[PDB]
Design brief:
A hairpin with a 4-residue loop joins strand 7 (110-111) and strand 8 (116-117). This protein has a five-stranded mixed β-sheet with strand order 3-11-10-5-6. The protein has helices at 38-41, 118-124, 192-195; strands at residues 3-9, 12-13, 53-56, 60-66, 83-89, 103-108, 110-111, 116-117, 128-132, 140-150, 167-178. 7% of the residues lie in helices and 29% in strands. The structure holds a molecule of 4 linked components (BGC-BGC-BGC-BGC) and copper (II) ion (CU). The PDB classes it as metal binding protein.
């Protein structure tokens, strides 16, 4: 249970973005049903918010998370797992991020050297999660999506035991990208409802074993 407070551009807080440039869900509840339309942008994914984060291709974005109040414990430490960041064209205001539209731009899973998950690092860094917009990105409006997946109950799948299963915490953010000479259009065209499956070893995952690797769902980070 966690959601976003605000976005920072090159270390500058843009200010409370909830229902401003973030499509904020009404609460911190997870999505579990891989068939749910809310898997992409959460329960209010389809409702436009009025503002777009102003950023340039190449900029460092920080997404700030919290649990109950800004600056708190961010997420219960039981909720180990990966954090992935995606981008899609902003097709129209009432897009909900369903369909074959996404490209992965950043990921962290499990680091065997430090036995540390992305979620451990999120907590240690007070809910600040950093990534770069590709400098080649063609200028225009995009939806950015950042997802925390918690695996504390992933040792069963939702289709078999609906009380358990992977927990997805997606957050979609509206961004208006200034170009720096790039022409690249993200083209993985990944579709969460089709591409995430209960058979996926990174979804049907037992975090309570000796493993030293975690397979992050979806394609590798988009290139060129
Ligand atoms: O399954 C084998 C494995 O189990 C390990 O124990 C797990 C439990 O399996 C799992 O159910 C449990 O889930 C907790 C979770 O850790 C909490 O963070 C969460 O807290 C919620 C709360 O339920 C909500 O009411 C509230 O609104 O939000 C908070 C989060 O902010 O509650 C769930 C339900 O129990 O996690 C356990 C690990 O901590 C064993 O440890 C292991 O030995 C077994 O092999
Ligand atoms: Cu939770």
């Amino acid at each position: 249970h966690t959601r976003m407070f605000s976005v920072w551009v090159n270390g500058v807080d843009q200010g409370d973005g909830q229902n401003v440039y973030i499509r904020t869900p009404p609460n911190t509840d997870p999505i579990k049903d891989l068939a749910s339309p809310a898997l992409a942008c959460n329960v209010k994914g389809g409702e436009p918010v009025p503002q777009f984060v102003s950023a340039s291709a190449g900029d460092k974005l920080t997404f700030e998370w919290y649990r109950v109040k800004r600056g708190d414990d961010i997420i219960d430490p039981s909720h180990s797992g990966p954090i992935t960041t995606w981008i899609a064209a902003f097709t129209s205001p009432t897009m909900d991020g369903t369909g074959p539209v996404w490209s992965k731009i950043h990921e962290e899973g499990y680091d065997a050297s430090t036995k540390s998950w992305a979620v451990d690092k999120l907590i240690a860094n007070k809910g600040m999660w950093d990534f770069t917009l590709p400098s080649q990105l063609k200028p225009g409006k995009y939806m950015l999506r950042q997802e925390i997946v918690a695996h504390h109950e992933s040792d069963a799948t939702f289709d078999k035991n609906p009380k358990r299963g992977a927990q997805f915490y997606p957050s979609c953010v509206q961004v208006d990208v200034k170009g720096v000479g790039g022409d690249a259009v993200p083209d993985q065209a990944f579709d969460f409802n089709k591409g995430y499956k209960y058979s996926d070893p990174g979804i049907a995952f037992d975090m309570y074993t000796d493993f030293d690797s975690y397979p992050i769902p979806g394609p590798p980070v988009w290139d060129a």
